Amino acid sequence: DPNKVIKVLASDGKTGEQREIAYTNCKVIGNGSFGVVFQAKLVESDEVAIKKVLQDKRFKNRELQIMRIVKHPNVVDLKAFFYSNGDKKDEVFLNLVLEYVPETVYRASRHYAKLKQTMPMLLIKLYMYQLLRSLAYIHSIGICHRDIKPQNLLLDPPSGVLKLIDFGSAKILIAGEPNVSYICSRYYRAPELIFGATNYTTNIDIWSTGCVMAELMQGQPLFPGESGIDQLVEIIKVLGTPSREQIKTMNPNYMEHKFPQIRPHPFSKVFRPRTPPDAIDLISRLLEYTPSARLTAIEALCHPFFDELRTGEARMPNGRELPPLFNWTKEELSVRPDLISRLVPQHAEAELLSRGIDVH
Known part of the structure; x- marks a missing residue:
């Protein structure tokens, strides 16, 4: 004052x-x-x-x-x-x-947990779509967020926009530089991080978003580990035991240690029965032990899961029309010209850039 x-x-x-x-x-x-x-x-x-x-x-x-x-x-x-x-x-x-x-996706989710109902399936699509695009962008410019979690997702209940927030622990990953392993909030920490890898890539942000998506459908964290080592157990309890080749890609030094054998308890069974089979598939392709095996930031956007947004026929439970999702730049699309067909539905084509390569 x-x-x-x-x-x-x-x-x-x-x-x-x-x-x-x-x-x-x-x-x-x-x-x-x-x-x-x-x-x-x-x-x-x-x-x-x-x-x-x-x-x-x-x-x-x-x-x-x-x-x-x-x-x-x-x-x-x-x-x-x-x-x-x-x-x-x-x-x-x-x-x-x-x-x-x-607001934040977290407090949004907490709201629904009071009302004992899980948050609307479409809203999940819309939020997760924006996040992945957000990643696809910063990643293309070499930036790893290193903290993708509900609390760091800006939300706007009326408009339904998502914004990635808190670059405080973000780092631009120059090839061949070691980086701190103890990073991300525990639940959303990628497995290679629990194996203490220091040569990891942006693929870790992808792992986190998988744990975010799941959490929105579950109404509660997917891997609620109680400590460092426990976090790796909670993951094996669902994904199964990592292969020799799997532990090889994470950290070659930890690839010999003795681990309990548990079979991959399939996702189709891990989620509520009413859960869409496309949402199951997506999460499955984001939560891989091998960082390279995970769908990349852009690739995920092209998943069948995000088709209900591309028709331009869907509306919020608010009643309102949905926020900008297709206002692409030349820079944005040039990262993967390969997949230009999916990212741009025909209903928004009337703008610029067209069908010519137009690569930047």
Whole structure:
């Protein structure tokens, strides 16, 4: 307090150009050791989040560099960023201004769990579609999120849009660099991570989304492991025991250890009886022990599961029309020209790019 406007010179998220911004009514939403998050109101009546982190002026910010190079309907939005002085020279803070979070897939799911009904099947398609596209994008630009989980999925109940949120633990994966194994929230941690691999790829974000999808249908986490080692057990309890070749691809050093033998208890039986057989198939092709064997970010979008969205005949249980899903860019499609037929249904073709290769 009090209720007061504070002005500061900032830089636009899209271009480094300087523009003044002003905001008021800020208080803390959450407190980590690596950033305080403020909920403020940008002068116009647009609610925001400001993330204030300590930043060593002697090098770049992991997070900033990504937010700067990332624009997409399904990621979050860096509005402005600005540097706040600590005291004099002793330290310097970096403030990120990010679009506010109406809700999250998690709290959405919690809502339905009170009403004892699982969340609508179509809504799952719509949410998971947007996530996968969001991945397909950042992955194409080399970025691994390393934290895909319900809590980090921005939601907007009326409009039904999804946005990938929290790039705080995200890293751009340069080939041949070792990376921390203890990453992701436990439930959604990929098996190769539990095997301590340090040479993993974006395929891990794919694993996580599988655990997310399942959780939405189950109303409860698929692999609710209680610790590090237990998490690997919970997975074997469903997928079965990994093969010699399977454990080979995850981590060649752990490929000899003695493991209990349990048969792959099929998914068709793991889910409720009323569950669509296409949803079962998709999850099955996302949850593979071998990272390369998992459907890639784009490939998944072309699954039969996401056909009910491509007709343009489906509507929300809200009654409303469904959000942008097909406003593709040249960049977006060029990652896989191969599969241009599925991604674009004929009903939206009237825009640009056409049928010519048009590869960027």
